[PDB]
Every structure is written in C-alpha cells, then in structure tokens.
Amino acid sequence: GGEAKARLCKLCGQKGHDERSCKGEAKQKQG
Ligand SMILES: [Zn+2]
Numbered sequence: 740g741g742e743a744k745a746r747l748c749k750l751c752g753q754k755g756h757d758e759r760s761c762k763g764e765a766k767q768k769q770g
Contacts, residue, residue, distance in 0.1 A: 749758035 745757055747754045748756050748761050750761045750763055751758075
C-alpha cells in the first residue's frame with residue numbers, strides 16, 4: 740500500500756524514503 744508520489748532512495752536504493760530526506764551530509768575533507 741502507498742498513495743504517495745516518491746521514488747526509492749537514491750543513496751540507499753530502497754523503497755519507502757528518498758535521498759532528499761536521507762542524511763546525505765558527509766565530511767568532504769582531504770587528509
Ligand atoms: Zn536512503
């Protein structure tokens with residue numbers, strides 16, 4: 740069941756949530 744317009748997570752690749760809501764804030768630093 741599901742009456743909502745939303746595609747699978749682009750970072751998790753699962754059904755239920757999305758990348759926009761997924762925590763996509765990683766530390767991008769050289770070291
Ligand atoms: Zn995700």
